[PDB]
Design an enzyme around this catalytic site. Structure first.
Site, PDB file in Angstrom:
ATOM      1  N   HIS A 128      46.010 -12.593  48.702  1.00  0.00           N
ATOM      2  CA  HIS A 128      46.522 -12.042  47.425  1.00  0.00           C
ATOM      3  C   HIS A 128      46.263 -10.545  47.388  1.00  0.00           C
ATOM      4  O   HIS A 128      45.348 -10.061  48.073  1.00  0.00           O
ATOM      5  CB  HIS A 128      45.983 -12.732  46.163  1.00  0.00           C
ATOM      6  CG  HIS A 128      44.522 -12.549  45.925  1.00  0.00           C
ATOM      7  ND1 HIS A 128      43.556 -13.325  46.524  1.00  0.00           N
ATOM      8  CD2 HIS A 128      43.888 -11.679  45.104  1.00  0.00           C
ATOM      9  CE1 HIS A 128      42.376 -12.931  46.076  1.00  0.00           C
ATOM     10  NE2 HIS A 128      42.534 -11.915  45.198  1.00  0.00           N
ATOM     11  N   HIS A 142      44.773  -8.120  45.654  1.00  0.00           N
ATOM     12  CA  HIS A 142      43.701  -7.401  44.954  1.00  0.00           C
ATOM     13  C   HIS A 142      42.992  -6.437  45.918  1.00  0.00           C
ATOM     14  O   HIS A 142      43.087  -6.677  47.115  1.00  0.00           O
ATOM     15  CB  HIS A 142      42.627  -8.358  44.401  1.00  0.00           C
ATOM     16  CG  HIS A 142      43.063  -8.968  43.098  1.00  0.00           C
ATOM     17  ND1 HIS A 142      42.457 -10.110  42.616  1.00  0.00           N
ATOM     18  CD2 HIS A 142      44.003  -8.606  42.184  1.00  0.00           C
ATOM     19  CE1 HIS A 142      43.007 -10.441  41.449  1.00  0.00           C
ATOM     20  NE2 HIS A 142      43.935  -9.537  41.166  1.00  0.00           N
ATOM     21  N   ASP A 189      40.009  -6.063  46.867  1.00  0.00           N
ATOM     22  CA  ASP A 189      38.982  -6.593  47.781  1.00  0.00           C
ATOM     23  C   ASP A 189      39.596  -7.369  48.940  1.00  0.00           C
ATOM     24  O   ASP A 189      38.798  -7.846  49.784  1.00  0.00           O
ATOM     25  CB  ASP A 189      37.893  -7.376  47.036  1.00  0.00           C
ATOM     26  CG  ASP A 189      38.414  -8.461  46.117  1.00  0.00           C
ATOM     27  OD1 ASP A 189      39.508  -8.344  45.536  1.00  0.00           O
ATOM     28  OD2 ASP A 189      37.726  -9.498  46.032  1.00  0.00           O
ATOM     29  N   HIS A 190      40.912  -7.508  48.989  1.00  0.00           N
ATOM     30  CA  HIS A 190      41.551  -8.219  50.095  1.00  0.00           C
ATOM     31  C   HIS A 190      42.683  -7.422  50.743  1.00  0.00           C
ATOM     32  O   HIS A 190      42.881  -7.538  51.970  1.00  0.00           O
ATOM     33  CB  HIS A 190      42.096  -9.628  49.699  1.00  0.00           C
ATOM     34  CG  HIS A 190      40.975 -10.343  48.992  1.00  0.00           C
ATOM     35  ND1 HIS A 190      39.846 -10.846  49.594  1.00  0.00           N
ATOM     36  CD2 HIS A 190      40.852 -10.593  47.675  1.00  0.00           C
ATOM     37  CE1 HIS A 190      39.083 -11.381  48.650  1.00  0.00           C
ATOM     38  NE2 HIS A 190      39.675 -11.256  47.450  1.00  0.00           N
ATOM     39  N   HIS A 202      45.168 -17.383  40.695  1.00  0.00           N
ATOM     40  CA  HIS A 202      44.250 -16.213  40.798  1.00  0.00           C
ATOM     41  C   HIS A 202      45.072 -14.919  40.676  1.00  0.00           C
ATOM     42  O   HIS A 202      44.678 -13.995  39.946  1.00  0.00           O
ATOM     43  CB  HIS A 202      43.390 -16.299  42.078  1.00  0.00           C
ATOM     44  CG  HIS A 202      42.433 -15.152  42.187  1.00  0.00           C
ATOM     45  ND1 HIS A 202      41.191 -15.104  41.602  1.00  0.00           N
ATOM     46  CD2 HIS A 202      42.591 -13.965  42.845  1.00  0.00           C
ATOM     47  CE1 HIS A 202      40.601 -13.960  41.879  1.00  0.00           C
ATOM     48  NE2 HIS A 202      41.422 -13.259  42.620  1.00  0.00           N
ATOM     49  N   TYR A 224      39.107 -14.278  33.268  1.00  0.00           N
ATOM     50  CA  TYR A 224      40.485 -14.468  32.794  1.00  0.00           C
ATOM     51  C   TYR A 224      40.523 -15.163  31.427  1.00  0.00           C
ATOM     52  O   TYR A 224      39.769 -16.136  31.237  1.00  0.00           O
ATOM     53  CB  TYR A 224      41.318 -15.323  33.761  1.00  0.00           C
ATOM     54  CG  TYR A 224      41.595 -14.684  35.113  1.00  0.00           C
ATOM     55  CD1 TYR A 224      41.000 -13.490  35.533  1.00  0.00           C
ATOM     56  CD2 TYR A 224      42.475 -15.342  35.975  1.00  0.00           C
ATOM     57  CE1 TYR A 224      41.281 -12.950  36.786  1.00  0.00           C
ATOM     58  CE2 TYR A 224      42.768 -14.815  37.239  1.00  0.00           C
ATOM     59  CZ  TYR A 224      42.163 -13.620  37.624  1.00  0.00           C
ATOM     60  OH  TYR A 224      42.484 -13.137  38.865  1.00  0.00           O
ATOM     61  N   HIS A 254      36.889 -14.951  50.067  1.00  0.00           N
ATOM     62  CA  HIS A 254      35.413 -14.810  49.873  1.00  0.00           C
ATOM     63  C   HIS A 254      34.773 -16.003  50.580  1.00  0.00           C
ATOM     64  O   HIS A 254      35.031 -17.138  50.150  1.00  0.00           O
ATOM     65  CB  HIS A 254      35.049 -14.879  48.372  1.00  0.00           C
ATOM     66  CG  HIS A 254      35.632 -13.684  47.634  1.00  0.00           C
ATOM     67  ND1 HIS A 254      35.012 -12.459  47.568  1.00  0.00           N
ATOM     68  CD2 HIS A 254      36.808 -13.598  46.946  1.00  0.00           C
ATOM     69  CE1 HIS A 254      35.792 -11.629  46.856  1.00  0.00           C
ATOM     70  NE2 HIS A 254      36.831 -12.309  46.496  1.00  0.00           N
TER      71      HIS A 254
HETATM   72 ZN    ZN Z   1      41.273 -11.507  43.664  1.00  0.00          ZN
HETATM   73 ZN    ZN Z   2      38.544 -11.386  45.786  1.00  0.00          ZN
END
Ligand code: ZN
Ligand code: ZN
Length: 266
Positions: free
Chosen positions: A83, A85, A87-88, A159, A190, A224
């Site tokens: 996805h 975001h 952090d990815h 997500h 969320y 993660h």
């Molecule tokens: Zn995420």
């Molecule tokens: Zn993440």
């Protein structure tokens, strides 16, 4: 007199930024990210595939790990994402600039990537990264083939709208290993019920639990690693405790139901 607040950087646990050497998952699949963020390199006679990159600052580290594995910048053909975001997908723009790599993603992921994660349905502009554009748009169940490794997209919205599981078959100890790189099933902070920016959020997550439960899944990996009980720092036993896809889906659903209940109570 009180100024507006300074911009707040997206800071994370140190372990998310702790470099690791390549950790072999299967014959042609390696974890090349950090101790706490997955970045999978799949090597082919016909070029390499990267699934996720982790945080924006991980680009050089990834390129170093690639080199260690015999993959030059020209050799990286394709970038896939769980996805979009920070952090990815954090270093994707930079990886595109520095390598041969093209990005394939679904339309939701492509739109979010192209805005560098800004105007997130939940995070607003809190968690952003350099924007990148997709080269190829994929549909649910579409395959991409790289050197006879077939990658299949399984949409699992929630997500993020564009959350995707990617599946492929590698080998290990002479036998097929069906790898499932399932996206996050968390909903951190969320608003789940009656969210005007995501009206069918609950329904989507429920469908996504079912999707994850049914993936072809000898080995589960997750963006993660902790979510799938991987410990990248545990060397030979890194994957020993990994959850099944079924167990991951169940745990996520139970957590989600808890969150729904707490939100109703909040
Ligand atoms: Zn995420
Ligand atoms: Zn993440």
């Amino acid at each position: 007199e009180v100024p507006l607040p300074q911009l707040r950087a997206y800071t994370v646990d140190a372990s998310w930024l702790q470099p690791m050497a390549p950790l072999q998952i299967a014959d042609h699949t390696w974890q090349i990210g950090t101790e706490d963020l997955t970045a999978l390199l799949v090597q082919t006679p016909d070029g390499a595939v990267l699934l996720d990159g982790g945080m924006p600052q991980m680009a050089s580290h990834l390129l170093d790990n690639m080199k260690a594995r015999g993959v030059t910048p020209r050799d990286l053909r394709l970038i896939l994402l769980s996805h979009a975001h920070a952090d990815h997908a954090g270093p994707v723009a930079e990886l595109k600039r520095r390598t041969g790599a093209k990005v394939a993603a679904n339309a939701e992921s492509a739109v979010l990537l192209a805005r560098g994660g800004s105007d997130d349905l939940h995070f607003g502009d809190g968690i952003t990264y350099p924007p990148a554009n997709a080269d190829r748009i994929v549909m649910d169940g579409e395959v991409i083939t790289v050197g006879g490794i077939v990658f299949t997209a399984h949409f699992m919205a929630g997500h993020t709208p564009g959350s995707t599981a990617w599946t492929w078959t590698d080998t290990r100890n002479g036998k097929p290993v069906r790898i499932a790189y399932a996206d996050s099933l968390s909903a951190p902070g969320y608003q789940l019920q009656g969210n005007p920016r995501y009206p069918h959020l609950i329904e989507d997550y429920r469908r996504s639990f079912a999707t994850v439960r049914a993936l072809p899944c000898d080995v589960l990996l997750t963006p993660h690693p902790g979510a799938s009980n991987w410990d990248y720092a545990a060397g030979a036993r890194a994957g020993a405790k990994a959850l099944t896809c079924k167990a991951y889906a169940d745990a996520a659903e139970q957590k989600f139901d808890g969150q729904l209940a707490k939100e109703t109570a909040g």
